């Protein structure tokens, strides 16, 4: 169990996580959606600009303690 | 210009299956059927397709020796308008914007796409809107950003007296004629502009490009 992360967003609550270092970030992304009401395809999870995907590992990107993840909502335009 | 095999793929892609099936993975984006469906006629494109497509331009230019391109997330420009240079400071990390020849920033005005071309070689900012609106302050904001990056990352003031902007007028560039194709012009404006190519196209080409694009995405290749 290696690392603290804060996940924030616009019309979304602040929620602190406690993710293991080599655990795939899908769980993080999923638990957050649940807690929100929102569908999993509905938000994009950005760390420092870069998109996190489901398989991505906090090790693999060199996340750091108290790093913030950022939540944006799907955007469409005509 | 497509084949039967290609036209089949495109069809099997464009409907009939699980909302969430993964169709193409790259640039650490996962393009899901529901995403690809945004490429269907008159459908508005979501960020996922335009981010994916932008990245394909970069990999295109790289393989045909086109000008060095750097591509910004459709999210970048909201966030920088929202909470300033400081909000988007990290976003540009493993990268020095200033060794790149062309910077493409897609604008997501409300329910509507645009584009800013930042041309390092010309020290110029070009705003394009398929719907004919002016990009005056989109522009001032982004330049101000480059000042800030130049200052923050290179430690060099920018020579703002050498930098020009111009937003392209309804007659200068191709306009859209439906209420759905902007995100396609945004993409095609990127494509021509990233090859130093004058814009020969028109709305009438856009449905093929649409059909064509889902191919490009699936096969992660451009035509």
UniProtKB/Swiss-Prot annotation, chain A:
GO terms for biological process: cellular response to cadmium ion; cellular response to heat; DNA repair; negative regulation of action potential; negative regulation of delayed rectifier potassium channel activity; negative regulation of DNA binding; negative regulation of DNA-binding transcription factor activity; negative regulation of DNA-templated transcription. Keywords: Acetylation, Cell membrane, Chromosomal rearrangement, Cytoplasm, Host-virus interaction, Isopeptide bond, Membrane, Nucleus, Phosphoprotein, Ubl conjugation, Ubl conjugation pathway. The keyword Transmembrane helix does not apply. Its main location: nucleus. Residues 1-78 form the Ubiquitin-like domain. Changing residue 17 to A: Abolishes binding to PIAS2. The keyword Heme does not apply. The record marks 17 as: Interaction with PIAS2. There is a cross-link at residues 4, 18, 20, 26-27 (Glycyl lysine isopeptide (Lys-Gly) (interchain with G-Cter in SUMO2)). GO terms for molecular function: enzyme binding; potassium channel regulator activity; protein tag activity; RNA binding; small protein activating enzyme binding; transcription factor binding; transporter activator activity; ubiquitin protein ligase binding. Residues 1-6, 18-21 are annotated as: (Microbial infection) Interaction with Tula hantavirus. One of its GO terms (cellular component) is postsynaptic cytosol. There is a cross-link at residue 6 (Glycyl lysine isopeptide (Lys-Gly) (interchain with G-Cter in SUMO1)). Ubiquitin-like protein that can be covalently attached to proteins as a monomer or a lysine-linked polymer. Covalent attachment via an isopeptide bond to its substrates requires prior activation by the E1 complex SAE1-SAE2 and linkage to the E2 enzyme UBE2I, and can be promoted by E3 ligases such as PIAS1-4, RANBP2 or CBX4. This post-translational modification on lysine residues of proteins plays a crucial role in a number of cellular processes such as nuclear transport, DNA replication and repair, mitosis and signal transduction. Covalently attached to KCNB1; UBE2I increases cross-linking with KCNB1 and PIAS1 decreases cross-links with KCNB1. Interacts with SAE2, RANBP2, PIAS1 and PIAS2. Interacts with PRKN. Covalently attached to a number of proteins such as IKFZ1, PML, RANGAP1, HIPK2, SP100, p53, p73-alpha, MDM2, JUN, DNMT3B and TDG. Also interacts with HIF1A, HIPK2, HIPK3, CHD3, EXOSC9, RAD51 and RAD52. Interacts with USP25 (via ts SIM domain); the interaction weakly sumoylates USP25. Interacts with SIMC1, CASP8AP2, RNF111 and SOBP (via SIM domains). Interacts with BHLHE40/DEC1. Interacts with RWDD3. It is linked to Non-syndromic orofacial cleft 10: A birth defect consisting of cleft lips with or without cleft palate. Cleft lips are associated with cleft palate in two-third of cases. A cleft lip can occur on one or both sides and range in severity from a simple notch in the upper lip to a complete opening in the lip extending into the floor of the nostril and involving the upper gum. This is Small ubiquitin-related modifier 1. It comes from Homo sapiens. The gene is SUMO1.
From Swiss-Prot, chain B:
The active site is at residues 112, 129, 182. Transmembrane segments: none annotated. Polyubiquitinated; which leads to proteasomal degradation. It comes from the Eukaryota. It is found in: Nucleus, Nuclear pore complex; Nucleus membrane; Cytoplasm. Residues 30-194 are annotated as: Protease. Belongs to the peptidase C48 family. Protease that catalyzes two essential functions in the SUMO pathway. The first is the hydrolysis of an alpha-linked peptide bond at the C-terminal end of the small ubiquitin-like modifier (SUMO) propeptides, SUMO1, SUMO2 and SUMO3 leading to the mature form of the proteins. The second is the deconjugation of SUMO1, SUMO2 and SUMO3 from targeted proteins, by cleaving an epsilon-linked peptide bond between the C-terminal glycine of the mature SUMO and the lysine epsilon-amino group of the target protein. May down-regulate CTNNB1 levels and thereby modulate the Wnt pathway. The N-terminus is necessary and sufficient for nuclear envelope targeting. Binds to SUMO2 and SUMO3. Interacts with the C-terminal domain of NUP153 via its N-terminus. Interacts with MTA1. This is Sentrin-specific protease 2. The chain holds residues 367 to 589 of 589 of the full protein.
